[PDB]
Design a protein around this ligand. Structure first.
Ligand SMILES: NC(=O)c1ccc[n+]([C@@H]2O[C@H](COP(=O)([O-])OP(=O)([O-])OC[C@H]3O[C@@H](n4cnc5c(N)[nH+]cnc54)[C@H](O)[C@@H]3O)[C@@H](O)[C@H]2O)c1
Ligand SMILES: NC(=O)c1ccc[n+]([C@@H]2O[C@H](COP(=O)([O-])OP(=O)([O-])OC[C@H]3O[C@@H](n4cnc5c(N)[nH+]cnc54)[C@H](O)[C@@H]3O)[C@@H](O)[C@H]2O)c1
Ligand SMILES: OCc1c(F)c(F)c(F)c(F)c1F
Ligand SMILES: OCc1c(F)c(F)c(F)c(F)c1F
Ligand SMILES: [Zn+2]
Ligand SMILES: [Zn+2]
Ligand SMILES: [Zn+2]
Ligand SMILES: [Zn+2]
Lengths: 374, 374
């Protein structure tokens, strides 16, 4: 029995940028008021976790990263009403406090209690529940899922179907929901439209799934790695193009292919140049372009505002625009009801102890999602 | 008496950038097939016309500028079906061909036959109807309203109510429609929202009118010329701010005043820095910013795409997003029914011969719209 007690468990600690994770024992404090301690069952490797390693994303180190996961509630703090010990849960890297101006807005999801904008790497109360070799370790996005056990604020956890397969539905914690919502909710892709998707990783494939679900007639996948094209076509891409095969800039190729510009474009990579290319390739009068990728910290892009004056719309979103705690349980229910598939995103299933091997598969281009199992 | 004949008349010819207009005789050819020759009655001075003088806006010179106007059809070429001699008309600087993919789209208005994106300074057929001193003179946006007579393509003219007061409704040909539509159609301002309007000239006042019509609860006018504030409050601003009064950047001031960002912001000036400031000041998760001002030719802005990733929407539009030929007669009918006011925009009236005085008024900061009478 662990409730009310410090847990000693295994976690993947990142002590400094550009080094492997260290798999070692940590101490996990019991949950305080309005906090939930979760035994992890499965976590995905998202490129955003790799951004912490590479320094593309700046967050306080040392840290327990991981934000795409599912597990089972081990214990609850005083005052928790929304989950109970034994419940299957997905941690929410975008919280839903329910009280801020964003949470009350019909179309906002980027709750003001988030730890993304200006990361502290703590619990809501400004402290950490993790120690390692006598040192305090930072949280990541209020989730920290690269651990056998984590502690999250109640506003950062959702209860899901007790019959959920956690090794699949962990992807609803980030990559599936982000891509699918970016198409269906943020862009609001229309029936019969032409879409261009830049980046055919886990998130870009989920964008394709959403564009197909919304009835797009043409879905053009764009990637510099042609090994990504077969799976993109399997989930709905009608064409794939590699910019490296062309003498012309790819915005010009895509404008020609679409007879004057695409209806909807998506940047799902994290590069400044592809964000401007993706905007430019949407039709100048009525096109919509959605930024999904995360680029290098503190870098500005350059663009000509005439691209917007003609009528284009440029937007971005976190987590597909979904209000996280309302949406995650519904997405799992929809998966259980066979409304979408997750298997196409899962290329590799490894034990947690092989986290570093899982990151190497991502960095080499081999994998889409590796699921780590505890 | 003039049908089929060259008309000699006075026009304001711009021979060189950064020089006064030259009021002098020009020859105006009769209309060819699907062309309309108009006797001008009234034309407004829009800041975009001044951009041609300043070189902010690049169009071939020498040119007859002017794009905000109203007149009476003198004659029609072969095959014209939509207007007749003696009809009151407004030239359409954004055409509506009715046949291209943008004209067919429910939300497009930037018709592919426009002469704004890559100006040629011609009729649709690539030729000019104007001669001066024996030399061909460019058209501007297919309209060229700074002339006693002009010739336009049929897709660039709308028939309006025969009882229209042309000295007022000329403003529907650019500044009113642009500002009003930018609020009501492009931004889709909501009841009870907070808006910020950068630039309180004729277009920005028209944006305020639209925000007030849409039911905004707060409309914050922003201008470095505090002389503009009284009229902004008359048409609906709840408060005005001058950036020069503050130690902190105005995006910070507006975020504070709106308890975390505005719902809707509008750039109605034409500066790269205020386009980025206006984006920044809208709420990071659900705010919308609309670019209305014309940027300086070929210059790029610099911005951090994290402004969009959180959830902001950035867009621009020409002519308030209105499909021009469908919309202009309806806007005139609504003016006739007192659904909106134009007199607040009109600060000065001059004869056409005093065009240069009218530009001096705009450049000094004194005027909103000067209306020139032929
Ligand atoms: N907005 C959100 O809420 C959110 C959520 C999840 C992921 N992300 C970001 O989304 C991006 C994609 O994540 P992911 O799918 O896990 O990554 P991934 O699996 O690494 O996929 C990226 C893809 O981009 C391809 N690529 C790289 N450079 C180019 C190029 N120049 N042109 C075209 N294709 C290129 C690459 O080959 C790969 O297939 C990353 O920047 C993540 O950080 C954002
Ligand atoms: N998108 C379109 O279809 C369309 C239509 C009409 C006009 N325009 C453009 O819209 C802009 C406004 O036109 P207008 O109302 O005729 O011009 P205007 O009357 O010159 O008004 C511009 C206002 O901006 C104010 N201003 C200047 N600099 C700053 C600053 N740094 N901060 C705040 N205020 C400042 C200035 O004092 C003035 O009151 C111009 O760039 C036009 O070219 C665009
Ligand atoms: O992949 C989701 C994700 C994001 F979209 C970010 F913007 C971010 F900063 C982050 F850490 C993250 F995990
Ligand atoms: O004022 C309307 C207007 C514009 F919005 C432009 F973008 C432009 F190029 C132009 F010449 C113009 F007159
Ligand atoms: Zn909230
Ligand atoms: Zn992620
Ligand atoms: Zn058209
Ligand atoms: Zn204008």
């Amino acid at each position: 029995s662990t409730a009310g007690k410090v847990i000693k468990c295994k976690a993947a600690v990142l002590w400094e940028e550009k080094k492997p994770f260290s798999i070692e024992e940590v101490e996990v404090a019991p949950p305080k008021a309005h906090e939930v301690r979760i035994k992890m069952v499965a976590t995905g490797i998202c490129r955003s976790d790799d951004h912490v390693v590479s320094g593309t994303l700046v967050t306080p180190l040392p840290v327990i990263a991981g934000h795409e996961a599912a597990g089972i509630v081990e214990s609850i703090g005083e005052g928790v009403t929304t989950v109970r010990p034994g419940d299957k849960v997905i941690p929410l890297f975008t919280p839903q406090c329910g009280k801020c101006r964003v949470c009350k807005h019909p179309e906002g999801n980027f709750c003001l209690k988030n730890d993304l904008s200006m990361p502290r790497g703590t619990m809501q109360d400004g402290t950490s529940r993790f120690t390692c070799r006598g040192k305090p370790i930072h949280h990541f996005l209020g989730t920290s899922t690269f651990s056998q056990y984590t502690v999250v604020d109640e506003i950062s956890v959702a209860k899901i179907d007790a019959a959920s397969p956690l090794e699949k539905v962990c992807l609803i914690g980030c990559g599936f929901s982000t891509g699918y919502g970016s198409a269906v909710k943020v862009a609001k892709v229309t029936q019969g439209s032409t879409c261009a998707v830049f980046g055919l990783g886990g998130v870009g494939l989920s964008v394709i799934m959403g564009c197909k679900a919304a009835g797009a007639a043409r879905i053009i996948g764009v990637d510099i790695n042609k090994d990504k094209f077969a799976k993109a076509k399997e989930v709905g891409a009608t064409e794939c193009v590699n910019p490296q095969d062309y003498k012309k800039p790819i915005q010009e190729v895509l404008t020609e292919m679409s007879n004057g510009g695409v209806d909807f474009s998506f940047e799902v990579i994290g590069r400044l140049d592809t964000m401007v290319t993706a905007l430019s390739c949407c039709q100048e009068a009525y096109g919509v372009s959605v930024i999904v990728g995360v680029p290098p910290d503190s870098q500005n892009l350059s663009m000509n505002p005439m691209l917007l004056l003609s009528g284009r719309t440029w937007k971005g979103a976190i987590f597909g625009g979904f209000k996280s705690k309302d949406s995650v349980p519904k997405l799992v229910a929809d998966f259980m009801a066979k409304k979408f598939a997750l298997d196409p995103l899962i290329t590799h299933v490894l034990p947690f102890e092989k986290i570093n091997e899982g990151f190497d598969l991502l960095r080499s281009g081999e994998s889409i999602r590796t699921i780590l199992t505890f």
